[PDB]
Design a protein around this ligand. Structure first.
Ligand SMILES: Cc1ncc(COP(=O)(O)O)c(CNCC(=O)O)c1O
Ligand SMILES: Cc1ncc(COP(=O)(O)O)c(CNCC(=O)O)c1O
Lengths: 394, 394
């Protein structure tokens, strides 16, 4: 029955307003492979809003690996890993990931999102605590909420606030600190040396979400612990396959005893169907390519350094990025929607960040680099961005 | 740091005990396509533990559709649907699903699990209520927990307990009833006529999870509302693609206003990467096949009716199934593990249900049919099951 349900959704009008003004640019329907240019409505659009940092979703070797896995294994495993959903190739991928991030063991999940839900929901319980950076990804907030623990947020990269909040807590309790490695909004890196120093003082577990770090920072792209040399101070390394690894799915890597507990206690792996064979194969081949072909990471950072310098030289106001995420401040929600749509209509795809995700005065567009971008494409996007920021009067 | 974390996992010894006794049969590594026979450790094993009800994960047309989508679109969309992750083929699949279940609109999620999280987390809020059948799937319990509402469980298919629990609630609040259509444990069907009758009396929204119903009950497999003719009394139809549809992903279908609210407010679609092209294409082709080839559903039910009659004639104690899930009671956790492993070692794959999921005296094996099974295979499995139940002294 719909009476109260209709009332619950009645006040949500921002989408009707964006559509009526001709500003709507969510769920833009792409007609082609994710690449430096995509086809939208039959026309070519430069893609600066992707998470495919190494451009690997179009690698013919990766497509072929996925197609060969369909031929051998079919379209799906039709069950949880726990029951009838495990393939030899899932186990192979766990072994290869464990080696890549320097841990004993790993467990796959069918999404990155579900990779966060698993350990956050089942390790800390009643009378225990989870400490979260306030900018942590939605999946981390949701995972922690599924736990029976007390969830405490600390100020963004604020080690005094983390330390104080941990100091308040009863000694006879378990504590788990979970952080993004690279934060997607501003593209900044966690203070992992200080956070792990605090964790070691209070015997808290440390979990890092490396969604935006894998294939980006660390030796051969192995992520945030690898970047800082702090593998031995991080209990759990979470990753997704949907970004540099060009696929779908995720993982959690750690000590074999903790991983064995997770694979038999995390509801998001016990009660969800396993990754498709095509996605296991594509992830395995992308992981081989990231490690054996240092070019990709190198070219990603040449593009990042080039685009960042060009944006600062044109007078754009950038956030405190340390990654291929270039946050360009606009500081008005209306201007952010307008700039986004005008760029779309001129052949440039960027992602807006607006209220209520952020305060109006912190609204921005995120311009993300891909190893496969050219300096010519970067130049064309920035040319168009200068013109639209002028038209918009930013 | 690991001191307290080590203590949190210290008491979990059932897996070490199962492995040490040689009884462990979780995460069995399959070497072949999901089919009526699978390869485990180089040997052939009859599969009676699958959710591929129509045997479609090996359909050459479905494999080819997936392989052609890899060729055109690549290995992944590398973002949320909300941003850079929408393809024309995702929209096509939503339109085809909406038509199939008789609703205005639909939104895809990358997993079934995440399809439950979406509407349960964002429609009911502070001062509202979610009413759940106590046997509802883990993803429904987890979705409801992510809401800011009060979650109330009612007795399994107990309409007096649902009615009483709703009667206690303040009139000026929203209420949402969520149920499995077919329940996976016992394979029983929700009392949807009575539940919708109650919902209509209290103006509560109705959501049905049709994970085990799609491709199984309803006209051309359209699910539980379709089975009862109650499309107009169900607000939201949830489905997965991982079972009859032989893929990965899921959906929620409903009124265009509710679906528009979900696609801009459900964290599990806004903040998770979209389905892979291969999985969209495989789902589209499976959905065409289920509707255009009535054979598949027909043969599933011939196998179900045959196997159920054969089990009852051999004196097995079955649960109150109304589906291709045949629950065979064992009523001892030890016997359930032993029967499971002995069947594995004799070439038969079944799924155990044990404590703490159920009371010891309700422990069972689930024997699930596939349209592609033969009567010869059914006969061979039941022959082996009689022998193992004798060896085990059930
Ligand atoms: C009733 C029900 N609802 C939702 C889901 C989630 O769908 P996905 O597996 O596609 O994420 C399942 C999964 N069934 C697998 C299990 O519980 O083992 C299910 O049985
Ligand atoms: C930091 C972080 N962690 C986890 C995930 C979840 O991974 P999957 O998308 O593979 O489920 C994302 C997703 N980023 C997409 C977004 O927020 O739009 C992420 O940005």
């Amino acid at each position: 029955s719909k009476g109260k349900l209709g009332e619950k959704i009645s006040q949500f009008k921002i989408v009707e307003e964006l559509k009526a003004k001709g500003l709507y640019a969510y769920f833009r329907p792409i007609q082609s492979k994710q690449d430096t240019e995509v086809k939208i409505d039959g026309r070519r659009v430069l893609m600066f809003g992707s998470n495919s940092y190494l451009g690997l979703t179009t690698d013919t070797r990766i497509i072929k690996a996925a197609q060969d896995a369909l031929e051998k294994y079919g379209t799906g495993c039709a069950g949880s890993r726990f029951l009838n959903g495990t393939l030899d190739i899932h186990v192979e991928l766990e072994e290869k990931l464990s080696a890549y991030v320097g841990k004993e063991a790993a467990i796959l999940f069918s999404t990155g999102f579900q990779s966060n839900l698993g350990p956050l929901s089942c390790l800390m319980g009643r009378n225990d605590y989870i400490l979260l950076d306030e900018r942590d990804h939605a999946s981390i907030i949701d995972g922690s909420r599924l736990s029976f623990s007390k969830v405490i947020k600390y100020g963004h990269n604020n080690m005094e606030d983390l330390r104080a909040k941990l100091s308040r807590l009863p000694e006879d309790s378990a504590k788990l600190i979970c952080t993004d490695g690279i934060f997607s909004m501003e593209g900044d890196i966690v203070n992992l040396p200080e956070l792990t120093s605090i964790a070691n003082e209070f015997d808290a577990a440390v979990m890092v979400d490396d969604a935006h770090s894998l294939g980006v920072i660390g030796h051969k792209g192995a992520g945030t612990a690898s970047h800082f040399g702090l593998n031995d101070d991080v209990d759990l390394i979470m990753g997704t396959f949907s970004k540099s690894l060009a696929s779908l799915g995720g993982f959690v890597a750690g000590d074999a005893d903790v991983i064995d507990f997770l694979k038999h206690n995390a509801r998001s792996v016990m009660f969800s169907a396993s990754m498709t064979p095509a996605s296991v194969a594509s992830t395995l081949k992308a992981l081989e390519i990231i490690q054996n072909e240092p070019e990709h990471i190198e070219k990603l950072w040449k593009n990042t350094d080039y685009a960042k310098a060009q944006l600062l030289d044109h007078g754009f106001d950038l956030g405190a990025t340390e990654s291929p995420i270039l946050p360009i401040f606009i500081r008005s929600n209306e201007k952010t929607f307008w700039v986004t749509k005008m760029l779309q209509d001129d052949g440039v795809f960027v992602n807006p960040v607006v209220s209520p995700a952020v305060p109006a005065e912190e609204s921005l567009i995120r311009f993300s680099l891909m190893a496969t971008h050219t300096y010519d494409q970067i130049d064309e996007a920035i040319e168009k961005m200068v013109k639209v920021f002028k038209q918009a009067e930013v």
